[PDB]
Amino acid sequence: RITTPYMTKYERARVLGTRALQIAMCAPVMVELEGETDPLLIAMKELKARKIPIIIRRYLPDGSYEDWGVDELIIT
Amino acid sequence: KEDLPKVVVQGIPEVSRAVIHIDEQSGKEKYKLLVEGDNLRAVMATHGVKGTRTTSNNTYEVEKTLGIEAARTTIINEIQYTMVNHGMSIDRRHVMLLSDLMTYKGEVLGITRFGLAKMKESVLMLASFEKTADHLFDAAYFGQKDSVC
Amino acid sequence: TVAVMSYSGYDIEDALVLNKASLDRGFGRCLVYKNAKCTLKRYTNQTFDK
Amino acid sequence: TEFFFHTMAGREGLVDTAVKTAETGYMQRRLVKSLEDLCSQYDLTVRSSTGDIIQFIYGGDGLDPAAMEGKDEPLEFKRVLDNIKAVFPCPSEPALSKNELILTTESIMKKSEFLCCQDSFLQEIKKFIKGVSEKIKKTRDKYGINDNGTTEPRVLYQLDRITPTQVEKFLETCRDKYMRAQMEPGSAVGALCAQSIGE
Amino acid sequence: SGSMDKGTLGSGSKNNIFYILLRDWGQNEAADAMSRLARLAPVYLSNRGFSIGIGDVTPGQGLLKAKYELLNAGYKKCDEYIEALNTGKLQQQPGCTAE
Amino acid sequence: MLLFCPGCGNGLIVEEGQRCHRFACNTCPYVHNITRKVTNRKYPKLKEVDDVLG
Amino acid sequence: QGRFRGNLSGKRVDFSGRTVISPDPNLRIDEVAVPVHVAKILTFPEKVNK
Amino acid sequence: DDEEETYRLWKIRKTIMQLCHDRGYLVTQDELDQTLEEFKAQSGDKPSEGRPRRTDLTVLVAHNDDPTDQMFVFFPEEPKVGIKTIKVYCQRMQEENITRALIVVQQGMTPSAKQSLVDMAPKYILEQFLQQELLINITEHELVPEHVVMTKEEVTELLARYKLRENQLPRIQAGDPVARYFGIKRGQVVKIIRPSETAGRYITYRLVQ
Ligand SMILES: [Zn+2]
């Protein structure tokens, strides 16, 4: 709860990459795509709709961690 | 006769040449000393010199005389001045990070292979940068386990 | 016949615009000749490349 | 003779660039090989690969050099205020005096979302607000503008016109820009510094 | 008010209109504005015509007269300085020799 | 200064004999006693008083 | 040309091309034009999904 | 002489007073703010002034920590201090039961005397100081930031707030001029307040090692 509430660009890139890799491997879609044959476009649509089922696990340098939901974080 | 005229009678032996620079500000024209020497402690210790506001270009002398933080500040100021002399601007955070990396172990360590070896610990990077065989054989002798951090 | 002017913004940095009709009538037409060499040598034994 | 001297100067420039290419290439290689290990962690502390801390906070404040709008400053308050006034001109709200501006600024700044912001940025915001309030006071004293809002020439209110809506918009925009200009954790700050010094 | 130039549309430093668009309304708006500029400016530049000729760099009569007078004055002053240094005493600037 | 023996042409050094200081050569018994004062000035260049710049 | 500098830090990869550039203002700043010939050679592995 | 030497002595005494005040020892405001006229009143000539004895200081006690703790300042008259002078100073401190002492040399210390001073005794702490360095106060320099030695409680609070270890803090050598100015030992932490370009300040920390 102490880190920045804004979702960084690195987290955005990694979440979009993981979601595109999953969707390309026959993952279920939660935004009801309309003729999008590109998995990255579907991942971006899910991110904009805030329906990505991925929880970021931010690790502190000492060893502590904290979980942040994609819908919980702030996007730009 | 070969060295009698070459004896020092007054002044700092390390100091080779000092000139009187003047600033012509509209409020007042002030006088300062520009010394082409390598002895900051002696210049500060001389009578009539305001040692509280004396700087230098040699980072090693500043480190040895006024501490590591003064050396970091001198590095920052000198890098920024050298960059401005060419008309190109760099954000101060970059030079601050560079000075902090050079002055985080208490001693000003250079970017050369010696300073990089004194700072870093990873064997693979030391081998890949310079002195591959020497570093590899030294690591094999010490049996130093290298992580993948 | 070169005309020094800006046209269509396709000549921004050192680029130049060519005329299609000029190239169609032989302007700038070039020929590239390459060589392909092969050798049929006799070896020590009484046999040859054929 | 002039052509020969010009050719001499051109060849001098050419050899200077030829030496500079290799020299800066070697310098860039060394700087990147030395600085590639640093990274910005999530606790706002720049640490090396072995875990040792190089800086407790990057640049002393923690702002992104790529998102630096001003001359080594996060925001240019004058331009931001002008943009807020231009984008959201409220014609149905009266102007604010010096005391009213200071009061609304102190009321808005004490909210919860401004607590997590750094103290230096809040002090700079207070300084800019005090400066613009002094400017408005000087204008109203020069032109005899009354804070009651009953002056006959209303065009006098158009000299330095400010409304609490514009104040809130300016403060929220400054807070959002300061929050979005901070160092995003995980960035390879060392490599960026090496490149921005070598280039 | 004003005319666009490198100080406002170039990649020199801040105060660029594209930089303001990027910092105020996001990346997409700035990209769209740059695309519209790159699609608009060449069309108008081609429809208006912009050329350089030998007449655009030729000197005028007043320019030639001024250049001649300036060359004469400079050569006379240089000859005076040469004569002062070679024969006699020349005022030596501080921090340097007479040469 | 630099002095040479008229006999063989080698360099003369300054030594002390039994009566007075004398020039002598290391390769011949030639000597020369000093009668009056002998001096060799060099006139070194004076440190020119540097001026303030700016 | 050693292993570290020539084969570990920097190494050659496939699925890449090299071509001379020419200006084209009719394209967006985030877009780049690729020739048909190179596009037919550089392939992308797409996984069959629903 | 007799004009620059007394000025150097007065400035060295003022710098020593400032150092003792910064370290926490008890010094009155008159000793800190001492003009050249008062020093001339004490002694206005070089032969009248006594470097080995007239300038020694024994009233230096840590009033903040313990008045019983005593610190001494020496001013050897010879330019190079030998083994015999170090032994005399050590036996005098043994007589007066003083554990901390400072030695303000005039030109330097011989390598044998340096090595002996390094391993005199863990209880007898003696620091070598050149008069050339003491002619200017390092703390008053514009490049040198403000350094404050933190107590064990503050170090514990720092390590708890940042979840760090001692070895992870930035290092600073014991031979650093500021380190010898404050007389900090291995394991202590110093907070440094760098003045930023704006009105704010940058707070950093360094561990002596
Ligand atoms: Zn002879």
Where in chain A are the domains?
1-76
Cα-based distances in Å from H113 to D128, E28, H133: 61, 73, 19
With beta carbons under 8 A apart, name residues in chain H contacting D119. 200
| CA–CA dist H93, A2 (Å, integer) | 54
| CA–CA dist F25, F9 (Å, integer) | 9
Strand F12-16, strand F21-25: pairing:
antiparallel
Residue among D132, D75, D142 at smallest CA distance from D100? D132
Neighbouring residues of B57: CB distance < 8 A, sequence distance ≥ 6:
B74, B78
**Is residue D120 within 8 Å of residue H201, measured between CB atoms?**
no
Tell whether domain H1-136 is in CATH 3.40.50.2000.
no
3-state secondary structure H50-93: CCCCCCCEEEEEECCCEEEEEEEEECCCCCEECHHHHHHHHHHH
Neighbouring residues of A31: CB distance < 8 A, sequence distance ≥ 6:
A42, A45, A46, A49, A51
| CA–CA dist E42, C6 (Å, integer) | 8
| CA–CA dist G14, A28 (Å, integer) | 33
| CA–CA dist E37, E16 (Å, integer) | 14
Q: What is the per-residue burial (b if ≥16 Cβ within 10 Å, else e) of F18-31?
A: eeeebbbbeeeeee
- How close is the Cα of F10 to the center of ligand 1, in Å? 5
> D3 CA to chain A: closest CA distance, Å?
56
D63 DSSP 8-state letter: B
CB pairs under 8 A between A and D: 31
**Is residue H171 within 8 Å of residue B104, measured between CB atoms?**
yes
With beta carbons under 8 A apart, name residues in chain F contacting E94. 51-53
**Is residue A14 within 8 Å of residue A29, measured between CB atoms?**
no
Cα-based distances in Å from E63 to C25, E52, E69, E75, H24: 47, 20, 10, 18, 78
| CA–CA dist H74, B66 (Å, integer) | 23
Cα-based distances in Å from D189 to A9, D91, E11: 14, 46, 24
- Residue spans of the domains in chain H: they are 1-136, 137-209
Cα-based distances in Å from G48 to A15, A25, A29, B1: 21, 8, 15, 96
Determine if residue F8 is labeled as part of a ligand binding site: yes
- Could you give phi then psi for residue H154, rounded to 5 degrees? -65, -35
User: First-to-last CA distance in chain C?
Assistant: 56
**Is residue F39 within 8 Å of residue F48, measured between CB atoms?**
no
Neighbouring residues of D123: CB distance < 8 A, sequence distance ≥ 6:
H199, H200
Neighbouring residues of A9: CB distance < 8 A, sequence distance ≥ 6:
D184
DSSP string, D67-104: G--SSSSS--HHHHHHHHHHHS--TTS----HHHHHHH
SS3 H116: helix
Neighbouring residues of B62: CB distance < 8 A, sequence distance ≥ 6:
B40, B55, B56, B70, B71, B74, H143
- Tokens (6 digits) for H15: 């710098």
**Which residue's structure tokens are 């501080």?**
E94
| CA–CA dist E72, E74 (Å, integer) | 6
- Using a 10 angstrom Cβ sphere, with 0-12 exposed, 13-18 middle and 19 or more buried, the burial of residue D71 is exposed
Residue among D154, F11, E77, A63 at smallest CA distance from F3? F11
> D141 CA to chain H: closest CA distance, Å?
31
Which structural technique was applied? cryo-EM
Dihedral angle, C-alpha E15, E16, E18, E24, nearest 10 °: 0
Residues of G with CB under 8 A from a CB of C: 22-25
| CA–CA dist B33, B19 (Å, integer) | 6
Neighbouring residues of B7: CB distance < 8 A, sequence distance ≥ 6:
none
| Crossing angle (nearest 10°) for helices H111-118 and H83-96 | 30
SS3 D132: helix
| CA–CA dist B89, D25 (Å, integer) | 20
Among A26, A41, A42, which would you mutate to test the G interface (most chain G Cβ atoms within 10 Å of its Cβ)? A26
Cα-based distances in Å from D150 to D144, D145, D157: 12, 9, 10
H193 DSSP 8-state letter: E
G43 and E CB contact within 8 Å: no
Residue among H184, H198, H186, H196 at smallest CA distance from H147? H184
**Is residue H73 within 8 Å of residue H183, measured between CB atoms?**
no
Neighbouring residues of F24: CB distance < 8 A, sequence distance ≥ 6:
F12, F13, F14, F15, F30, F31, F32
SS3 H96: helix
Taking CA–CA distances from G47, the nearest residue in chain A reads A24
Q: Please list the residues that pair with F25 across neighbouring strands.
A: F12
Neighbouring residues of H84: CB distance < 8 A, sequence distance ≥ 6:
none
E96 and F CB contact within 8 Å: no
Closest CB from D41, D179, D184 relative to A61:
D41
- Tokens (6 digits) for D158: 């158009």
Contacts 24+ apart (CB under 8 A), F47-53: F50/B19, F50/B20, F51/B20, F51/E94, F51/E95, F52/B19, F52/B20, F52/B21, F52/B22, F52/B31, F52/E94, F53/B19, F53/B20, F53/B21, F53/B22, F53/E94, F53/E95
At position B52, the amino acid (one-letter code) is T
Taking CA–CA distances from A63, the nearest residue in chain H reads H163
At position B124, the amino acid (one-letter code) is L
- Could you give phi then psi for residue D192, rounded to 5 degrees? -60, -45
- Tokens (6 digits) for B34: 């520009």
Taking each continuous run of H as one helix and of E as one strand, the counts in chain E are 4, 0
- Tokens (6 digits) for H203: 């707070």
Question: Per the annotation, where are the binding residues of C for Mg(2+)?
Answer: 14
B130 and F CB contact within 8 Å: no
> B44 CA to chain F: closest CA distance, Å?
21
**Chain B (64-103) residues lying within 8 Å, Cβ to Cβ, of chain D:** 90-98, 100-101
- How close is the Cα of F19 to the center of ligand 1, in Å? 20
Residue among D102, D94, D166 at smallest CA distance from D131? D102
- Could you give phi then psi for residue E33, rounded to 5 degrees? -65, -40
SS3 H106: coil
Strand H189-195, strand H146-150: pairing:
antiparallel
With beta carbons under 8 A apart, name residues in chain B contacting H137. 52
Neighbouring residues of C9: CB distance < 8 A, sequence distance ≥ 6:
E38, E41, E42, E43, E45, E46, G23, G25
With beta carbons under 8 A apart, name residues in chain A contacting D45. 61
| CA–CA dist B53, D52 (Å, integer) | 33
Please report the sign of the dihedral spanned by the C-alpha atoms of residue D64, residue D70, residue D76, residue D82: negative
Residue among D161, D155, D157, D151 at smallest CA distance from D89? D161
H-run or E-run covering H18: helix H4-23
Strand H100-105, strand H125-130: pairing:
parallel
B144 and G CB contact within 8 Å: no
Residue D31 burial (CB count, 10 A): 21
Residue H169 burial (CB count, 10 A): 24
| CA–CA dist G24, G29 (Å, integer) | 10
Which CATH number applies to A1-76: 3.90.950.20, 2.40.50.140, 3.90.940.10, 3.40.50.1860?
Answer: 3.90.940.10
**Is residue A67 within 8 Å of residue A44, measured between CB atoms?**
no
**CA D139 from centroid of its chain's CA atoms:** 27
- Could you give phi then psi for residue H98, rounded to 5 degrees? -120, 130
Please report the sign of the dihedral spanned by the C-alpha atoms of residue A65, residue A68, residue A74, residue A75: positive
| CA–CA dist B75, B83 (Å, integer) | 12
Residues of D with CB under 8 A from a CB of H: 43, 45, 51-57, 60-61, 72, 119-120, 123-124
- Using a 10 angstrom Cβ sphere, with 0-12 exposed, 13-18 middle and 19 or more buried, the burial of residue E31 is middle
E27 and D CB contact within 8 Å: no
At position E18, the amino acid (one-letter code) is F
Determine if residue F25 is labeled as part of a ligand binding site: yes
Strand F31-33, strand H125-130: pairing:
unpaired
**Which residue's structure tokens are 């690969």?**
D49
Tell me how many degrees the CA angle B129-B135-B140 measures, rounded to the nearest 5.
140
| CA–CA dist D91, E49 (Å, integer) | 45
**Is residue H134 within 8 Å of residue H15, measured between CB atoms?**
yes
- Could you give phi then psi for residue H95, rounded to 5 degrees? -60, -50
Resolution in A: 2.9
Contacts 24+ apart (CB under 8 A), D128-133: D128/D77, D128/D81, D129/D101, D129/D102, D129/D105, D130/D102, D132/D81, D132/D101, D132/D160, D132/D162, D133/D98, D133/D101, D133/D102
- Tokens (6 digits) for H5: 């030497």
**Is residue H171 within 8 Å of residue H206, measured between CB atoms?**
yes
Q: Please list the residues that pair with H130 across neighbouring strands.
A: H105
Which CATH number applies to H137-209: 3.40.50.800, 3.90.1150.10, 3.40.50.300, 3.90.940.20?
Answer: 3.90.940.20
| CA–CA dist D195, D24 (Å, integer) | 11
SS3 A16: helix
| CA–CA dist G30, E17 (Å, integer) | 19
Chains F vs H: touching, with 3+ CB pairs under 8 Å? no
Residue B132 and residue G4: Cβ atoms within 8 Å?
yes
> E46 CA to chain C: closest CA distance, Å?
5
Residue C15 and residue G23: Cβ atoms within 8 Å?
yes
> H171 CA to chain A: closest CA distance, Å?
19
| CA–CA dist D16, D10 (Å, integer) | 10
**Is residue H98 within 8 Å of residue H69, measured between CB atoms?**
no
> D100 CA to chain A: closest CA distance, Å?
33
| CA–CA dist H190, H188 (Å, integer) | 7
